[PDB]
Design a protein around this motif. Sequence first.
Motif, PDB file in Angstrom:
ATOM      1  N   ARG A  98      -3.830   7.712   3.170  1.00 35.63           N
ATOM      2  CA  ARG A  98      -4.349   9.045   3.454  1.00 35.63           C
ATOM      3  C   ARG A  98      -5.802   9.170   3.019  1.00 35.63           C
ATOM      4  O   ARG A  98      -6.594   9.862   3.671  1.00 35.63           O
ATOM      5  CB  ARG A  98      -3.500  10.098   2.742  1.00 35.63           C
ATOM      6  CG  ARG A  98      -3.687  11.515   3.257  1.00 35.63           C
ATOM      7  CD  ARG A  98      -2.682  12.469   2.625  1.00 35.63           C
ATOM      8  NE  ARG A  98      -1.294  12.054   2.814  1.00 35.63           N
ATOM      9  CZ  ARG A  98      -0.550  11.512   1.853  1.00 35.63           C
ATOM     10  NH1 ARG A  98      -1.063  11.328   0.645  1.00 35.63           N
ATOM     11  NH2 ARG A  98       0.704  11.157   2.093  1.00 35.63           N
TER      12      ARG A  98
ATOM     13  N   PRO B  80       6.571  12.853   0.590  1.00 31.22           N
ATOM     14  CA  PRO B  80       7.388  11.685   0.240  1.00 31.22           C
ATOM     15  C   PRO B  80       6.546  10.419   0.178  1.00 31.22           C
ATOM     16  O   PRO B  80       5.483  10.309   0.791  1.00 31.22           O
ATOM     17  CB  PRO B  80       8.419  11.609   1.373  1.00 31.22           C
ATOM     18  CG  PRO B  80       8.334  12.930   2.086  1.00 31.22           C
ATOM     19  CD  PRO B  80       6.931  13.406   1.904  1.00 31.22           C
TER      20      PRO B  80
ATOM     21  N   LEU C 110      11.206   6.385   0.663  1.00 36.39           N
ATOM     22  CA  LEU C 110      11.747   6.138   1.996  1.00 36.39           C
ATOM     23  C   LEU C 110      12.413   4.770   2.071  1.00 36.39           C
ATOM     24  O   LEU C 110      13.479   4.627   2.681  1.00 36.39           O
ATOM     25  CB  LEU C 110      10.638   6.257   3.041  1.00 36.39           C
ATOM     26  CG  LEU C 110       9.971   7.627   3.165  1.00 36.39           C
ATOM     27  CD1 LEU C 110       8.820   7.580   4.158  1.00 36.39           C
ATOM     28  CD2 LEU C 110      10.989   8.681   3.570  1.00 36.39           C
ATOM     29  N   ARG C 111      11.796   3.756   1.460  1.00 32.18           N
ATOM     30  CA  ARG C 111      12.382   2.421   1.456  1.00 32.18           C
ATOM     31  C   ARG C 111      13.743   2.419   0.772  1.00 32.18           C
ATOM     32  O   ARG C 111      14.643   1.671   1.170  1.00 32.18           O
ATOM     33  CB  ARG C 111      11.436   1.442   0.761  1.00 32.18           C
ATOM     34  CG  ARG C 111      11.742  -0.025   1.008  1.00 32.18           C
ATOM     35  CD  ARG C 111      10.633  -0.913   0.456  1.00 32.18           C
ATOM     36  NE  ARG C 111       9.319  -0.593   1.008  1.00 32.18           N
ATOM     37  CZ  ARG C 111       8.375   0.067   0.343  1.00 32.18           C
ATOM     38  NH1 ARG C 111       8.601   0.472  -0.898  1.00 32.18           N
ATOM     39  NH2 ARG C 111       7.205   0.321   0.913  1.00 32.18           N
TER      40      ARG C 111
ATOM     41  N   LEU D 257       6.462   5.950   0.199  1.00 31.14           N
ATOM     42  CA  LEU D 257       7.092   4.820   0.876  1.00 31.14           C
ATOM     43  C   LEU D 257       8.251   4.262   0.060  1.00 31.14           C
ATOM     44  O   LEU D 257       9.305   3.928   0.615  1.00 31.14           O
ATOM     45  CB  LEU D 257       6.057   3.728   1.148  1.00 31.14           C
ATOM     46  CG  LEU D 257       5.000   4.026   2.212  1.00 31.14           C
ATOM     47  CD1 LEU D 257       4.139   2.798   2.463  1.00 31.14           C
ATOM     48  CD2 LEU D 257       5.650   4.503   3.501  1.00 31.14           C
TER      49      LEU D 257
ATOM     50  N   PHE E 280       8.117  12.613   9.760  1.00 29.23           N
ATOM     51  CA  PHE E 280       9.322  12.682   8.938  1.00 29.23           C
ATOM     52  C   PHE E 280       9.417  14.015   8.198  1.00 29.23           C
ATOM     53  O   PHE E 280      10.496  14.616   8.132  1.00 29.23           O
ATOM     54  CB  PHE E 280       9.353  11.510   7.953  1.00 29.23           C
ATOM     55  CG  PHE E 280      10.502  11.565   6.972  1.00 29.23           C
ATOM     56  CD1 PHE E 280      11.761  11.113   7.333  1.00 29.23           C
ATOM     57  CD2 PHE E 280      10.318  12.041   5.681  1.00 29.23           C
ATOM     58  CE1 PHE E 280      12.822  11.157   6.437  1.00 29.23           C
ATOM     59  CE2 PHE E 280      11.376  12.086   4.777  1.00 29.23           C
ATOM     60  CZ  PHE E 280      12.629  11.642   5.158  1.00 29.23           C
ATOM     61  N   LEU E 281       8.301  14.492   7.635  1.00 33.12           N
ATOM     62  CA  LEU E 281       8.314  15.769   6.926  1.00 33.12           C
ATOM     63  C   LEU E 281       8.541  16.944   7.870  1.00 33.12           C
ATOM     64  O   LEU E 281       9.130  17.955   7.466  1.00 33.12           O
ATOM     65  CB  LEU E 281       7.009  15.954   6.151  1.00 33.12           C
ATOM     66  CG  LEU E 281       6.893  17.181   5.243  1.00 33.12           C
ATOM     67  CD1 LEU E 281       7.987  17.180   4.185  1.00 33.12           C
ATOM     68  CD2 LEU E 281       5.517  17.243   4.594  1.00 33.12           C
TER      69      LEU E 281
ATOM     70  N   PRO F 287       0.829  -1.209   0.000  1.00 26.21           N
ATOM     71  CA  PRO F 287       0.000   0.000   0.000  1.00 26.21           C
ATOM     72  C   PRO F 287       0.861   1.255   0.000  1.00 26.21           C
ATOM     73  O   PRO F 287       2.017   1.253   0.428  1.00 26.21           O
ATOM     74  CB  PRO F 287      -0.814  -0.114   1.296  1.00 26.21           C
ATOM     75  CG  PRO F 287      -0.645  -1.535   1.756  1.00 26.21           C
ATOM     76  CD  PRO F 287       0.691  -1.974   1.249  1.00 26.21           C
ATOM     77  N   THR F 288       0.273   2.340  -0.495  1.00 24.08           N
ATOM     78  CA  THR F 288       0.946   3.627  -0.575  1.00 24.08           C
ATOM     79  C   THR F 288       0.367   4.594   0.451  1.00 24.08           C
ATOM     80  O   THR F 288      -0.723   4.387   0.990  1.00 24.08           O
ATOM     81  CB  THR F 288       0.826   4.228  -1.981  1.00 24.08           C
ATOM     82  OG1 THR F 288      -0.517   4.681  -2.198  1.00 24.08           O
ATOM     83  CG2 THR F 288       1.179   3.190  -3.037  1.00 24.08           C
ATOM     84  N   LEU F 289       1.124   5.663   0.716  1.00 24.20           N
ATOM     85  CA  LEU F 289       0.664   6.679   1.658  1.00 24.20           C
ATOM     86  C   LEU F 289      -0.594   7.374   1.153  1.00 24.20           C
ATOM     87  O   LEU F 289      -1.521   7.635   1.930  1.00 24.20           O
ATOM     88  CB  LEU F 289       1.773   7.701   1.914  1.00 24.20           C
ATOM     89  CG  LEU F 289       2.979   7.223   2.725  1.00 24.20           C
ATOM     90  CD1 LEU F 289       3.921   8.381   3.011  1.00 24.20           C
ATOM     91  CD2 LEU F 289       2.528   6.565   4.020  1.00 24.20           C
TER      92      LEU F 289
END
Lengths: 310, 322, 293, 310
Positions: free
Chosen positions: A10, B5, B10-11, B7, A81-82, A4-6
């Motif tokens: 989201r 960003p 980041l990975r 994943l 992180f951001l 899965p992606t952010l």
Amino acid sequence: EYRPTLAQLRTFVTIAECKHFGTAATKLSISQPSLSQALVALETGLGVQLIERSTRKVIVTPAGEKLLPFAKSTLDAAESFLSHAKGANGSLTGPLTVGIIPTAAPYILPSMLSIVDEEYPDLEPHIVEDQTKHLLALLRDGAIDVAMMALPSEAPGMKEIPLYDEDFIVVTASDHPFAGRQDLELSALEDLDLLLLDDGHSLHDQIVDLCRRGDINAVTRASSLTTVMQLVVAGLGSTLVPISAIPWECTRPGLATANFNSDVTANRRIGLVYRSSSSRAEEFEQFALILQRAFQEAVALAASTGITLK
Amino acid sequence: KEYRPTLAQLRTFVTIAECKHFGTAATKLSISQPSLSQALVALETGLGVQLIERSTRKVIVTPAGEKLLPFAKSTLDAAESFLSHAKGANGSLTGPLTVGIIPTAAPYILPSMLSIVDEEYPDLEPHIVEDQTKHLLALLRDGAIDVAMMALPSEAPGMKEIPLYDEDFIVVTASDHPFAGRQDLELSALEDLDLLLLDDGHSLHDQIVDLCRRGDINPISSTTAVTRASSLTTVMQLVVAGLGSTLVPISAIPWECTRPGLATANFNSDVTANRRIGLVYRSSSSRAEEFEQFALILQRAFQEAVALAASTGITLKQNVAV
Amino acid sequence: YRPTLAQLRTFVTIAECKHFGTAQPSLSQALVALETGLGVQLIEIVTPAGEKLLPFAKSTLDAAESFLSHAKGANGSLTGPLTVGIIPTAAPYILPSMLSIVDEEYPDLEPHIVEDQTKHLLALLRDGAIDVAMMALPSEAPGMKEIPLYDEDFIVVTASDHPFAGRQDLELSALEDLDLLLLDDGHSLHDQIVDLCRRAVTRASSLTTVMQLVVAGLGSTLVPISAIPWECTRPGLATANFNSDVTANRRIGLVYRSSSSRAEEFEQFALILQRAFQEAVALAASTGITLKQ
Amino acid sequence: YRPTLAQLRTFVTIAECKHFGTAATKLSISQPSLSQALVALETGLGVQLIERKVIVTPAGEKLLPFAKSTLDAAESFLSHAKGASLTGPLTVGIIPTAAPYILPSMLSIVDEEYPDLEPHIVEDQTKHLLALLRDGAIDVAMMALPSEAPGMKEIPLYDEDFIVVTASDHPFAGRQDLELSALEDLDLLLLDDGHSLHDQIVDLCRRGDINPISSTTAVTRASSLTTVMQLVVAGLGSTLVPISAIPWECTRPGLATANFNSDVTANRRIGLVYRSSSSRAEEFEQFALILQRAFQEAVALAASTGITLK
């Protein structure tokens, strides 16, 4: 193959909170078809129904309710992180899990939690109270970020931040001969029948090494200071407690305090211990200043009781 | 428009910082070398900061990269935990799974257990934590481990147990000991033995003290003794030297009971001296069916361990007739 | 009032002659003096109150009879009990040869073994719970005295398919390539130009568990040479040593209290341990596995 | 030849006290009398035990522990003889969520009504208590029923109700009509209290539906009531405490109490647990009455605060 992606997470979180499709899409500044497409891609990629679309409003499925907290913690981690990438430069923000030993937690938390709530509202503190061995275990693992304990923590892979030196005070019964004395020497520990915490508490070794400093060397055994205090009231021996514990443990009827003379130094060194691989040194040193302030507030509370301090 | 960003970026950044090369981070992620370099430059450009300093010898993480690396790893761990619970809810064994095992069972169950997951569950990423029962339950409440293999009952609240198997005990004496080789012992025979027990935090210590109290025995002379070991292999060396006997689980036979100077003995079929091993996990967990599937792996790994014990030729306890 | 041994010995003797044995005007007087001093009727048949007190009186004589027994062998070197603490990474590999030597050459000695970590041994050593401790030097503890025993080299244990398998020329730089699963006990690694000096989720508490992980290819480890016949002979393993210019070992010694007056007795026990180590090294060499040169 | 106790006390006291004029003063005997008992013990055994300063000989060091264990055995005989129901030593184990609240009344009762009794308290968790009970390290244990151990027998003592402790500003503060459904709204911080929540009317909604926790690090968790209370004042959640803990933990500023309605039953059953092989059943039954009395005094102290109880 599927991950899965952010953007998909989201979308899933915003839909579950806003409960409509035309209000989650506006908050994310994307189109309503784009919102529905990321959701179906997430549903198909995982093979589970996450959202039930009804005519009145959309509802989160039973399986969706179980996954929603895991998706939100993923977004909070990415948003964390951001935040630090944009030049945070050592500011108390986001989650911070702190482990504290039981002989210091209930006496440092009131002032420490009040300072964080008023002066660091973006900080999200999590408190873990356990003994020293389990704290270092949770510290080598990722379960906690930093630990408050007595130095030295004999651990190699950790780095220590010295916080303060906390003096000890003698707690006896009211009828005890040493009651009220402020000039005791270390030789006076021989006359006392000390009541100690069991073997996993660091206070147990902070007192047996204190007797061996130029003096002499069992069945009664408690796990908490409040239990030791009830034994001292009943006249089954005396004990040593740190000064910050005075307003919470030494104000009940039947107790009396006593201190050593100025030439004697009976204390413990409390510090902040974290992993050597950590790059959050300046963030922990800033949290160290909060703990130092919380200790001086705890000392002030002890002096407010009228009990003579060292 | 405003940059967020991904994943995959980041990975890439995390793998580069750990492996330090651009041809070993790409192989570990099973992607191409150009694909790796584009995600890094896209992440660097999107944030406007130099994350990696490229040299000819090796790659170094920049000062700004060192501060961001822990936050990127916690982001990946959170996303990997989301996929674990999404597939775990239906029984899938994918992603990391940190299992805790008591020390009297870990080295005897791991060989078959690790070989089964490597051949039949390649997506699973097992992590082993060997410690005493008290520390396992502590690490289980605080989330440091996902599941724990230990003896039932655990008596811990907020936890749920999955019964795995019942593991019989065997008596280990010296070769010259009178009871050596006997297969008809009663619980009263424990009085004659000078038992050497593990310390107080090992679950095997209490699985044997309650075993004597079942036969009207006072184990005061054996528990409050002076001699005290922390491992089975140390207890075995004391039994060879004739300083007493001990009881060990059958799965420990091929690894501890085949050295010279030892001899085995079992109780009678009417006596039941065993331990119940089970799987313990948090009640709040939503991966019940995933743990139920992992329970089948452990049950299979135990039957291979019992088969290895039977392969030694040493007589095992018979609980029933044949 | 305090009771005497002669009074206790009388009360125990009646019950200890109540079986297949028989135990006097004086006898009745010591019993009545014991009953009057305590104010309780002990003998009627033994009274109900006497039955509860009998085991405590019998354990008193067993302690006194043990004192006279040990008061005998007192003037000897290695006689009576001797409680020794040993670290877990050395106990099961030094015990077989150590107990065999004391059984054949010191029969009056009564050894008691305590296996635990370094901190708990020093704790039990200060509090008198053990008489001597076997551990790695330096112990850094004050008020203690150390007797250096031997220097024990390390050997690298990898899987059979590992690239370093069989190599006898490794440098300390090779530790970078390995994914080590360690017990911290004994670590002291440093080459002639390295500058290292050493003090993951997977974590084991025993060497036998670490070995099973190495067969499965989940990393490598370092073990002391005395552990080779007991841990490094199962299928799936392979050994490797550093080169002669590298020194990867641990210094094991005997540590006892400075206040102790049994120095000359412990020094004799140190020679037994030194001999037991050379027997353990010989057993390692008998396996055919190459040791560090 | 047989040694005497007076001779052993001389040898032990000399080995501990570094002079021969400090061991004699502690024994209230003369310096020549001390030296004569020692020389008689040396001649009777034919070995040198003691060597202008005294050192213990090598042979003396090996014998010293056996002489002290002989004295400990003799002192143990006088302790049990003192009145032989309830005489001599009695090692009782108590769980930490009950020890400091039952000890004050229990220790006061045994001091006034059972002077020959010699209580030693052992405070630790339930699992460690049962371990010490099997190994004979303690004689009896006070813990929550039912005890899953077969080799033990249980004596039911009392049922202790719980009360809900929230912050002062919390909405539920002061309510005396809560249902079990209200636990959903709370963010409970729970100790291993022994509690078992149960309504006389089983709500169908909450039957089964649980909320999964989700975090990379550990969640907030305390090991003592005094630490949990500091978290409740700061508004990091609520908790359940036994009524006997009210005067000692629920009287600080910033707290507020709340009870469930009469149809809800939230309590714990505390009992006395001892070995089946034990032959002092009739004595443990008598010690059970002391704990029952000590509990009613603890409940009376809780009611004396004016806080509404269940």
